[PDB]
Symmetry: D2
Subunit: 243 residues, 4 copies
């Protein structure tokens, strides 16, 4: 049965609004958070595949899970259009019963390299999950594996990337500029690398839009935009390409 394979009775019975007279607009609020959380589960799943592909020098496949990841990210961004229909007037009606962090979101941020050892606490409330979270904190990021990939093929990548303490969020590296300069200037020769650099900018960019949208919705519903970056050098290089 369609309902049986997708476990719809379980899925469709996870919505328990807790407002006194059952406010009409509470449902939107729940669903919206639930669809998002499910997409976060798909994202992590694909992204994990990409890291393995890179590790095994499998470009097209890894490129074939990053393409999907972008689509999913574009969805996490599109969904805000519906929550935008929630007005302050409607929110007053059930906001009361509320008082909010996502272990899946943090997982995704850890995966892209934005690591923060302090984040492990506040989550050891789920050891099994905190364990999955710790595993990522201790291993290279998507960006770092990309770099470990470049070194495996003749690109001047600083030795410290072969092995260091991965638990510290990567720091912008000047010595990386020329590596990315050479790639963009010779595209015929470095087409594989070139394609991957662009896929990564897409991923970090679609991701920024998602965070920005998120903040505008919070403004219009609850009222009173960071500048963090995942791939510094890929963005910095823009100012020097074409020496």
């Amino acid at each position: 049965t369609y309902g049986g394979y997708l476990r719809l009775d379980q899925l469709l019975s996870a919505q328990q609004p807790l407002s006194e007279p059952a406010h009409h607009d509470e449902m939107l609020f729940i669903i919206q958070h639930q669809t998002s959380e499910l997409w976060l589960k798909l994202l992590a799943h694909e992204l994990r595949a990409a890291i393995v592909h890179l590790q095994r020098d499998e470009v097209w496949q890894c490129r074939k899970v990053l393409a999907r990841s972008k689509q999913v990210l574009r969805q996490l961004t599109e969904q805000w259009s519906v929550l935008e229909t929630l007005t302050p007037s409607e929110y007053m009606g059930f906001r009361d019963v509320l008082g909010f962090q996502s272990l899946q979101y943090r997982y995704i941020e850890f995966l892209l390299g934005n690591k923060n050892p302090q984040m492990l606490q506040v989550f050891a409330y789920d050891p099994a999950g905190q364990a999955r979270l710790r595993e990522v904190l201790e291993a290279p990021s998507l960006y770092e594996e990309f770099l470990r990939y470049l070194a495996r093929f003749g690109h001047a990548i600083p030795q410290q990337y072969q092995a260091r303490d991965w638990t510290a969020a990567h720091v912008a590296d000047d010595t990386l500029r020329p590596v990315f300069e050479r790639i963009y200037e010779n595209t015929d020769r470095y087409w594989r690398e070139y394609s991957l650099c662009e896929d990564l900018v897409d991923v970090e960019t679609q991701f920024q839009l998602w965070r920005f949208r998120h903040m505008r919705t919070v403004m219009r519903v609850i009222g009173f935009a960071l500048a963090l970056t995942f791939f510094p050098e890929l963005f910095d290089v823009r100012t020097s390409v074409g020496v």
Copy 2:
């Protein structure tokens, strides 16, 4: 708690892939349909509110929930953009599944008006869900509660819409044509009706688009649209030059 208010342990434990050496793209298949089903649940919730508001002549309240419905419908449509990344080569790896309806989906169509009693039988199981169909099947459609709305305000609505066998899917009626003709050719006096009409044309189009996408996505994955909910609404376009 975040995870407690949303029931995340239950939600995120509803993904049961079943491949014997387990397949990678299977997960996409699942969560694709589950988020879709989740929006359908939110869509019905709003659509019902639209009917109640319509019965009370609460025009602005009604027009609104429809606005949200339009937005939800747009999401159901835009959403196929990720399933389209599933290739026949990938699908082979787990195609050994079934061959696939959707009670929730059917509920919305009944609600809009495409009534079909023969459907109640494809869900011989879980009579609670089957009971939901029957209950909405006997009530007037979203479109029909609109015609009764118009009757309450002096428009030439045929008597039969006051009471009849709601089980039978609406049938296009030529006698409505002049009613919508007066509305579109005098938009200032009838702005409320005018706006609701356009709201309805939006909901059908968006829905139509969604069905079209669904079919095109099926074409590329598995390999080898005349229904119309509000006929008179689309028909009048042809003669609104009176």
Copy 3:
């Protein structure tokens, strides 16, 4: 004739890339600015209708020119997805031939209330446009007409808004809080006002989204922001409504 009514010969004859050996990616770059510029012309047109409607107290007409404005604004936003495909490497090719402000953009910004008397002189060259621009600079904004509208129907709008120097950009006014506070608190009595507030929030939000996309594309293309606001009190009210 389809081609003659739209004046397509004139239209498809306005693309003159000046890259030395005709660089393949210049075309995207030009039409991109052009479609954007055509949408900006439609926007100003509708927005102008909106001002008139509000002055004449015609709510639903106002509303339904504002509904289209949102769509056009969403178009200016979506459009960036195509320019994002322009890579630094492709940009290098014709980068060196171009050496960039829109009079229609500033017109749109003036309309919404972000008035800046200094802009005038930067357009001393097409006195015709400068004059169009001055007309707007001197008249109340879309937002200001909205407030003047509320004053016409029993809302405690400060007397000063009946007449003053519209040359200065609107300044956040805290005496406006209780006015917008009361609206959101009895949706039933103020449904008209309630809807316009939300249409206005939509317009500023969609507009912010557009400015953000713009900036992210500049980053991925040229590399190395402003949190202005058009309707302050409509956004500030979020924090008090209901307490």
Copy 4:
């Protein structure tokens, strides 16, 4: 200068309403079709390149231009969202225009292979334009230059694709079935062909949505076959690829 590079004086003087009295909604009608027309111009420009790259066996390159091409087709589709705000009430106001086809639209159907000689004598007016149509009418389609790409790398391709009357619209070839069957059934070896296959299914699908959309907006504005298919066996193989 900005307005000089883009030729805005010409671009923004290409809107000639014909209403007397001037009708508010005529503008939307015009800019809607002109912006659409500009994108088509960029769409052709990229497609022609995709062909040349395909001729040169330059896979990644033919492929990038196709990605941008997909983005442009998406814009053409998403774009009807603003014309849907045009209502029968408004349309009556200027309806008196004419009973209405795009030379460029046909140029692109031809490029994709849906060729038709009777479709020439209908642009009976600027020969130079119908000339652009013929030049492509007798040239292989994007799909056919693809089939020839496949022939060069050892794929069982019928001889006729080597040379024939290109003026005729492709006819679904059953002997192509086992060819695509092998590519899909062994993606690692044929990753490039596998990629190009999928890229084509995207272009056709996005185009299908664009056509469906157009028809739906026509339905809601004016009043009362879309069974064409550019790459048939590509869609047909889906039903037989079974290990």
